[PDB]
C-alpha cells in the first residue's frame, strides 16, 4: 500500500488548500485548533444535508 | 586430440576445424564415462538432429520477406 497521498503534493498549484488564513507563528496553533473545532461541530449540525467540502478563511 | 591430420601451413595454434573428419567423435570423446552397447546409434549419430535448427532458420527467412520485417 504505496504512495505519498495523491492530492497532498498538488496543494501549492491549481488545487486550493482546504483552509486559508495567517497568524504570525506564535498564534498559528491557537488558530489551527479553532479552525478544526469549527470543522468538527458545524458539520454535526448539517448532518441531514449533502456536502462535498468545507473551506474556512479568516 | 591435436588430431593427426596436418593443418594447411604449420603454426603454433592447431586449425582444429580443418583437421577433424571423424576423429575423437564417439571413440575418445566419452573419456571416463560409462560405455553403452546400443545407445550410441541414437545418442551420438545426431547429424539429421542438428540440421533442423538450420532449416527452421532458412524457413523463417522467407516468412520475414512476406511479413515486411525484411
Amino acid at each position: 500500500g504505496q504512495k505519498v497521498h495523491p492530492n497532498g503534493i498538488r496543494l501549492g498549484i491549481v488545487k486550493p488548500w482546504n483552509s486559508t488564513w495567517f497568524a504570525n507563528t506564535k498564534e498559528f496553533a491557537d488558530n489551527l485548533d479553532s479552525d478544526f473545532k469549527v470543522r468538527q461541530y458545524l458539520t454535526k449540525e448539517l448532518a441531514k444535508a449533502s456536502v462535498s467540502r468545507i473551506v474556512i478563511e479568516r | 586430440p591435436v588430431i593427426k591430420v596436418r593443418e594447411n601451413e604449420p603454426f603454433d595454434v592447431a586449425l582444429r576445424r580443418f583437421k577433424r573428419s571423424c576423429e575423437k567423435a564417439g571413440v575418445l570423446a566419452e573419456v571416463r564415462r560409462r560405455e553403452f552397447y546400443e545407445k550410441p546409434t541414437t545418442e551420438r549419430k545426431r547429424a539429421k538432429a542438428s540440421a533442423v535448427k538450420r532449416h527452421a532458420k532458412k524457413l523463417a527467412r522467407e516468412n520475414a520477406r512476406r511479413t515486411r520485417l525484411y
Partner: protein
C-alpha cells in the same frame, strides 16, 4: 635434486635434432625431451609448478613445463624439434609455443594419441 651451478657453457654430444613427447592427463602435463632414436635427454612437469587442483592442468602450466625441459637440453645441443602428442587434455597449442620460444622449429605436430580397436573398459564414474 638441483644444485646452485655457475653460468652454463657446457657441451655434451651436440646432437642437433630431437623428438618431444607430451603426455597430457586431467591433473598434469608430463613433457619429456628425447633423442630421435628415443632416449630421455630430460623432462619437466606441470605438477612441480605446485598450483594444486584443476589449476595445474591449464595451458600456461603446459607452456612453462615445455620451457623448463627445452631449456635444459640446450646443453645436449638440440637446434630443431618434432613432437608427438598423447592425451585429450588442455595446452593443445600453448606447449607448442614454448618449444618454438626455446628458439626451435616445430613443423611436425603429429598427434599419436592412441585409439585402440575398442580396448579395455573405462571406470563408469557418474551415473549420468
Amino acid at each position: 635434486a638441483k644444485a646452485p651451478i655457475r653460468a652454463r657453457k657446457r657441451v655434451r654430444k651436440q646432437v642437433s635434432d630431437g623428438v618431444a613427447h607430451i603426455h597430457a592427463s586431467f591433473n598434469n602435463t608430463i613433457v619429456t625431451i628425447t633423442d630421435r632414436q628415443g632416449n630421455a635427454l630430460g623432462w619437466a612437469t606441470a605438477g612441480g609448478s605446485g598450483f594444486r587442483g584443476s589449476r595445474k592442468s591449464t595451458p600456461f602450466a603446459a607452456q612453462v613445463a615445455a620451457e623448463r625441459c627445452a631449456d635444459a637440453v640446450k646443453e645436449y645441443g638440440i637446434k630443431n624439434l618434432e613432437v608427438m602428442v598423447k592425451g585429450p587434455g588442455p595446452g593443445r597449442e600453448s606447449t607448442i609455443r614454448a618449444l618454438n620460444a626455446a628458439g626451435f622449429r616445430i613443423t611436425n605436430i603429429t598427434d599419436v594419441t592412441p585409439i585402440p580397436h575398442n580396448g579395455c573398459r573405462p571406470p563408469k564414474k557418474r551415473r549420468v
